[PDB]
Amino acid sequence: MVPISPIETVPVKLKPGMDGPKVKQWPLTEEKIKALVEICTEMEKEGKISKIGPENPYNTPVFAIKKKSTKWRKLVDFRELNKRTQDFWEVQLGIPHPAGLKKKKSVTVLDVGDAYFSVPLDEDFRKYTAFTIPSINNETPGIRYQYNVLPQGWKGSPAIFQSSMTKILEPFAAQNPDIVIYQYMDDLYVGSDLEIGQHRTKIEELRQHLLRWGLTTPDKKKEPPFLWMGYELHPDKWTVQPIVLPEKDSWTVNDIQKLVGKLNWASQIYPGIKVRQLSKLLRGLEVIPLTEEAELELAENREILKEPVHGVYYDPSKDLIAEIQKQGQGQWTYQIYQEPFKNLKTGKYARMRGAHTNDVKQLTEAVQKITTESIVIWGKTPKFKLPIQKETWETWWTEYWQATWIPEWEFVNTPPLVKLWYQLEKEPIVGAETFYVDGAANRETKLGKAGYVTNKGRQKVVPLTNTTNQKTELQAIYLALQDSGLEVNIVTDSQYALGIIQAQPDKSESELVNQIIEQLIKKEKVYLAWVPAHKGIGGNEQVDKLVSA
Amino acid sequence: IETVPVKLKPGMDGPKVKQWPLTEEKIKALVEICTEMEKEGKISKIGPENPYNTPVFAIKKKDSTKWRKLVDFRELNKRTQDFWIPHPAGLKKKKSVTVLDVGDAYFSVPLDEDFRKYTAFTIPSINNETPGIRYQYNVLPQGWKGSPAIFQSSMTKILEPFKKQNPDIVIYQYMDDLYVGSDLEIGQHRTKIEELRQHLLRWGLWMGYELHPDKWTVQPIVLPEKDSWTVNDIQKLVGKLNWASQIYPGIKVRQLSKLLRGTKALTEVIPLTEEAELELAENREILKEPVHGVYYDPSKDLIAEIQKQGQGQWTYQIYQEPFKNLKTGKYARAHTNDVKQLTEAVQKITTESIVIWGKTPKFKLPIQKETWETWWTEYWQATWIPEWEFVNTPPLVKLWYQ
Ligand SMILES: N#Cc1ccc(Nc2ncc(Cc3c(F)cccc3F)o2)cc1Cl
Numbered sequence: 012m013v014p015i016s017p018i019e020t021v022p023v024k025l026k027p028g029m030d031g032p033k034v035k036q037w038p039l040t041e042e043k044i045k046a047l048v049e050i051c052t053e054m055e056k057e058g059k060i061s062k063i064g065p066e067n068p069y070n071t072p073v074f075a076i077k078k079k080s081t082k083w084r085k086l087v088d089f090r091e092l093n094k095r096t097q098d099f100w101e102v103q104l105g106i107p108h109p110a111g112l113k114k115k116k117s118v119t120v121l122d123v124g125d126a127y128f129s130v131p132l133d134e135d136f137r138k139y140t141a142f143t144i145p146s147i148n149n150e151t152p153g154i155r156y157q158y159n160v161l162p163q164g165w166k167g168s169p170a171i172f173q174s175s176m177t178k179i180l181e182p183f184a185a186q187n188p189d190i191v192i193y194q195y196m197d198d199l200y201v202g203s204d205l206e207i208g209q210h211r212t213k214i215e216e217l218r219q220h221l222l223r224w225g226l227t228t229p230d231k232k233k234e235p236p237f238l239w240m241g242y243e244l245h246p247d248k249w250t251v252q253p254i255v256l257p258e259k260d261s262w263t264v265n266d267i268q269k270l271v272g273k274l275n276w277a278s279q280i281y282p283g284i285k286v287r288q289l290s291k292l293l294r295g296l297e298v299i300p301l302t303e304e305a306e307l308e309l310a311e312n313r314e315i316l317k318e319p320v321h322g323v324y325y326d327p328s329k330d331l332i333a334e335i336q337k338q339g340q341g342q343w344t345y346q347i348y349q350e351p352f353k354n355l356k357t358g359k360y361a362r363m364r365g366a367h368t369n370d371v372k373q374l375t376e377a378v379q380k381i382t383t384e385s386i387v388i389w390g391k392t393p394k395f396k397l398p399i400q401k402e403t404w405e406t407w408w409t410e411y412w413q414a415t416w417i418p419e420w421e422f423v424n425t426p427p428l429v430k431l432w433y434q435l436e437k438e439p440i441v442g443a444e445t446f447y448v449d450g451a452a453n454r455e456t457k458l459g460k461a462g463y464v465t466n467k468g469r470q471k472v473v474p475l476t477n478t479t480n481q482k483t484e485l486q487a488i489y490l491a492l493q494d495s496g497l498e499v500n501i502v503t504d505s506q507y508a509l510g511i512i513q514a515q516p517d518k519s520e521s522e523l524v525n526q527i528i529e530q531l532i533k534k535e536k537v538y539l540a541w542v543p544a545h546k547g548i549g550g551n552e553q554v555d556k557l558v559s560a
Numbered sequence: 561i562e563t564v565p566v567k568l569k570p571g572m573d574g575p576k577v578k579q580w581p582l583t584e585e586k587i588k589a590l591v592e593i594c595t596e597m598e599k600e601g602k603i604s605k606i607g608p609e610n611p612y613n614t615p616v617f618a619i620k621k622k623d624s625t626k627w628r629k630l631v632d633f634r635e636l637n638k639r640t641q642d643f644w645i646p647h648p649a650g651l652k653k654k655k656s657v658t659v660l661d662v663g664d665a666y667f668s669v670p671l672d673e674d675f676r677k678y679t680a681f682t683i684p685s686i687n688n689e690t691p692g693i694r695y696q697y698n699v700l701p702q703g704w705k706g707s708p709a710i711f712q713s714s715m716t717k718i719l720e721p722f723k724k725q726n727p728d729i730v731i732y733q734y735m736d737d738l739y740v741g742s743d744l745e746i747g748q749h750r751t752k753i754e755e756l757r758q759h760l761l762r763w764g765l766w767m768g769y770e771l772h773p774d775k776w777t778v779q780p781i782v783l784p785e786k787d788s789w790t791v792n793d794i795q796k797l798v799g800k801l802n803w804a805s806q807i808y809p810g811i812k813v814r815q816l817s818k819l820l821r822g823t824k825a826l827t828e829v830i831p832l833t834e835e836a837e838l839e840l841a842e843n844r845e846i847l848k849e850p851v852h853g854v855y856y857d858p859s860k861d862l863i864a865e866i867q868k869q870g871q872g873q874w875t876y877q878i879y880q881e882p883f884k885n886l887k888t889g890k891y892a893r894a895h896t897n898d899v900k901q902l903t904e905a906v907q908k909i910t911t912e913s914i915v916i917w918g919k920t921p922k923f924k925l926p927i928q929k930e931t932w933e934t935w936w937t938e939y940w941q942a943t944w945i946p947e948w949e950f951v952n953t954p955p956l957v958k959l960w961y962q
Contacts, residue, residue: 022609098611100680102691104578111687170608177691193689372928379934383581390584390686412954414868414898414927416935439792439826447823466825500826502795506956513954540826541956542795543802546813549791549820 015225043075046083093166109249110355115202126226331393367516395420436538443498446491447550450483461486492530504544574612575635589627643709647918654741659769663736666700862921
């Protein structure tokens, strides 16, 4: 007998003030009970369970399920015991992304469904795991078992299994820095850049090291490619599992919501995937008609999906590059790569839901998202190639009322270019007509007026139906813009309108804002000034009278 | 040598805060640092049975090149029971004040064995390719609101010799910081500071941050002095005066609006009437006096607002009730990184706030959340971290402070 080191146990507790489970053992058929008794005898023979006396007041139901086979399978249902077990520190919360892996010459996968049972359970906690095989004809006491090892289905088996493998593997990995090791489910991944001879050697050393804890792994009896978390992993490349966009002459809410999941998943490597209209068709499981804008966006998904695309692994010796494009309708698409045309991954960004927005702000947010994604995956910020001129960026951030920043980047001239569509003046314009604008509405009738009074005696007041103070204050500005030359000064008392225009939108949900934006784009110079209402400021007073009637 | 019993508030669990992404260099610094702290027993690995977590990262203090471990205990501090230092109103009046990182003294005091599980933190790995190294604290940790409250007995002793020797020096402690105020000359200053490092090495930290009070505390509101006023100038003045009237009683604008009588061109010059000028002068008078009924109340939150004025200038106000400013300032010292400047502004305002009231304010930051959350840890150099929210609507007030 070669001595085997023990696997130290992990203290487990139930949630505070809560107690074990006490749930009814269901009545079984005689055929099922017979099957349980045989299985449980073999588990006990192996050490996985033990017979308990009658003091134990806890019980978890147990079932027998027919292997779709003339053989039965045992199924202990811990749904109840789980609700009452303590929270654990999960480590698999973050899964690696293939784009962050390094290329490997050789890669093996051991299977570890034997060690999982060499992982004992905390003694003081076994009692909570009691189940009862009912007796034939209910004429004897049910057999009573409790677990001695992490049970399949228990809340704490994943964490404790992982944590125990980690600590076993740690010294071996530390004394073999020329390989990488990673564990998920019952699968150990070992890769290296050694020649296959040396590589199969070390896999052997690893199995030996696992023998010290009495953990037995499969013999030389797979290899690339691997299917894992929906990816296809090859030694020098990765891609997702295949993306098959179904044909359907009638699409429903379950079918449309599944067509954005596939396109979202595939969007991490398939360049230029878009999901706006299809995602919109889900606004707010009903057959929805695809717009003509969704059938041209789906026909563009099927041609990008026609053949496969592969992504490369990460080479820490090379810079990371990230490139963004404006797709339209608040959609952005990006690629991250180190050598031209060999992407490590791709992705997309969508406009946040707001009332008003502009291209520069969206670009900035996409940069931030790509930036955080890259810290996660590669531990560093990529260099950016952006469709925006250095001068444009500089004008934006030096005049924007918020603090803003994007990391190291260069202009790439691939239209459409992000630009500033207008710029307000810092000072009043000499020689430009001065428009005093005002607008008001009757809360009850929804009737109001908008108009302006200028220093040249120009005047206008337009009566309006179904409007609000806010809408008339913007309409007034709109009128002054419509009726003025290429240069104009505008005085408003509307804090509302100021707050909107000083945000510098280039697109809006309001068609009234968009008409103002369209007017602003056509002007050479606009100075917009604000005065407090009802203080008798000349012109403001005059026009307030005219519009509050 | 014997631990102080500590426990969270009633009915509050420990913190369960996800670790946020770290760059490779910050991961490497933390591995080296945490290895040594484990070798020195300040921390110990932990298993999956500990569910709590607090974020950690790595900074560089000002004028040093060595990485420092910073744990963002903001959640644990909220959940850490209250512990029953007063605030010396004289600290803010000293000609000068040096700030000393004494957080290292804490590592010599064990931590209540039962509280340790709550100091849980993870060193992440790039792309999550290896499990996060998990640790918890055995000693008082830097940044925890308990660590000063507990060490407060040991620190009084370490200082009595120096305090009894220099009864003019004021000495205050906030987080891992000692604030040593003086009224001497910097040279005499620096030495006494060097003096004060010896007690700690003798009882046993070489860095010292300078800092002198401002002048006005609440900067006055000032109006232009001009010989000719355009319509635009008078419109801006009336706007500023109307804003200021929420702060100050008898502000009047009747006679100035009167000048704006009709529909004039924005650039045309208005001579001021005699009334107009009188009214402007009485408002000037009013603005020289302090605000009425403006009191600090240590039971309420301090609030700091910041405005970006451009060209590296930043204005800020600290209040509790709107229009009742306790301090207003300006800052102009990164000539191309908006966010580095803002981050330094937040640090400077927070430091002033510790010296005046002994606590940190809640910031309203003129920045989008995602930008700020994706860049402030690169420019942070203090061992505390205040609270903040985000202004998404441009204040009309930015003008009244430029
Ligand atoms: N074919 C193939 C193939 C090619 C290259 C690599 N490179 C690599 N760098 C770091 C790791 C560990 C690792 C896995 F091995 C597996 C999943 C996650 C994980 F972090 O793997 C791995 C494989 Cl499996």
